[PDB]
Amino acid sequence: RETTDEARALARQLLEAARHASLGTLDPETGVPLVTRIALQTDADGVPLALLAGLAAHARALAVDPRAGLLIAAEAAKGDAMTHARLSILGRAVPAEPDENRRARWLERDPKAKVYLPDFRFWRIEPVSGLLNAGFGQAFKLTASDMLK
Amino acid sequence: TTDEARALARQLLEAARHASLGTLDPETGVPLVTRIALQTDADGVPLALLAGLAAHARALAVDPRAGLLIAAMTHARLSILGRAVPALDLPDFRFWRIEPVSGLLNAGAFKLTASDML
């Protein structure tokens, strides 16, 4: 339960390795969480960075209410899904500036993601809190500092 | 929407073993997204086996609204908006049906009704 530097480093290592995630948004009509799969990396300061189709369901939800959840799992893990390490973030979405360096970092890390680069937009998901599940035993509660550096 | 689209949703539903669960953080209202074991019940309705003490199980006790994602971007997947209601072999774990209101099916999207997925 008690957060250690080891727990902090696993959380940071998951974010550095992340190419995709499950994104939680609030359905405007009903306020029920909409859970969709997204391309997700970090930018320079290690803050989660999403690439969304600007008029898709999850992008429209964000436009109306920027409250956002992320699940980040180890994509390479083998065996039972429930023993994979995974990080839950509670955050707020913010449209991310134009940047030549950003649109390039992203391709070096995800080549496939040329198809997307149009109507496609970067969002920073600024963390408030985090839940680390290491694959076994009890989770760690994380602050925003715990996840970033 | 079409029969092959309804058939794809139930296909993903049938022999799904885990999912991303979306519940509402009670303090902040932010969607909390965690991984869960998920099966269908007798009648094809999503069924989650959830630890009573875990953040998500707490969250559903306060407000039973629940999202599910069942499946990286070329993978067929299914988002479900629904409401949770209570229903190896450790005691504190419990069963929930996530009762579908609507759905979003991504093959390559398609809006779906509760009965399109059952």
Residue numbers in the entry:
A (entry chain A): 7 to 123, 126 to 157
B (entry chain C): 9 to 79, 87 to 102, 123 to 143, 147 to 156
Quoted from the paper:
Within the opp operon is a gene (pden_1323) annotated by the National Center for Biotechnology Information (NCBI) as a pyridoxamine 5′-phosphate (PMP) oxidase-related FMN-binding protein. PMP oxidases belong to the same superfamily as HugZ-like HOs, which motivated investigation of Pden_1323 as a HO. Here, we show that Pden_1323 is an unusual HO that shows specificity for the degradation of c-type heme instead of b-type heme, differentiating it from all previously characterized HOs.
The X-ray crystal structure of Pden_1323 was solved and found to form a dimeric split β-barrel similar to HugZ. While the two residues of HugZ that form salt bridging interactions with the carboxylates of heme, His163 and Arg166, are conserved in the structure of Pden_1323 (His64 and Arg92), the entire N-terminal α/β domain of HugZ is not present in the structure of Pden_1323 (25). The inability of Pden_1323 to cleave full-length cytochrome c shows that the peptide linkage must be small enough so that the porphyrin macrocycle is not buried and is able to access the active site, while the cleavage of hemin at high imidazole concentration indicates that the histidine lower axial ligand (rather than the c-type thioether linkages or the peptide sequence) is the crucial factor enabling catalysis. In contrast, HupZ lacks both the N-terminal α/β domain and C-terminal loop and thus more closely resembles Pden_1323 (36).
